[PDB]
Design a protein around this ligand. Structure first.
Ligand code: ZN
Length: 162
């Protein structure tokens, strides 16, 4: 059976941990404030590399597989997760970001969520995306969350709306 943990507890286990350490928890609560200040989307390679340089003339070079490639556009979101007991900043990556977008606008397939966001933002439709992110404000989910010493960074591994 699944055992949930309060944000309060997670934070204190985090404070009391060594550098390389990582732990996963199941959390219940809501999403607050998807952040629109930073770059929402990034170019990624099929080699699981985020390290992708954009060259002139529609070229992209992957630092990992060390070659020019044709990248995908992936969502990387930063938000706050909040239960009755606490609040934390988390990073949500493409599988889960895309899943959220798709869940508010099911016309947008997970596969294309990043591109959708990029095309809107870069062509004067940022508002349309702000709107989108707002409808998630205070929506409740069950998350699987992971922390790690580096600061303590928290990442969403999994999301389910219930
Ligand atoms: Zn690569």
């Amino acid at each position: 059976q699944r055992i949930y943990s309060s944000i309060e507890e997670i934070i204190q286990q985090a404070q009391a941990s060594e550098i390389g350490q990582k732990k996963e928890f199941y959390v219940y609560g809501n999403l607050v404030s998807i952040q629109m200040k930073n770059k929402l989307y990034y170019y990624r390679c099929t080699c699981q590399g985020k390290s992708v340089l954009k060259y002139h003339g529609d070229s992209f070079f992957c630092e990992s597989c060390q070659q020019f490639i044709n990248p995908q556009v992936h969502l990387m979101l930063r938000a706050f997760v909040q239960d009755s007991t606490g609040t934390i900043p988390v990073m949500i990556f493409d599988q889960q970001s895309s899943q959220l977008i798709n869940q508010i606008d099911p016309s947008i397939h997970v596969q294309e969520a990043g591109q959708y966001v990029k095309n809107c933002i870069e062509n004067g439709q940022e508002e349309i995306i702000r709107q989108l992110f707002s409808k998630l404000d205070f929506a409740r989910f069950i998350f699987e969350i992971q922390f790690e010493n580096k600061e303590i960074a928290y990442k969403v591994l999994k999301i389910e709306k219930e």
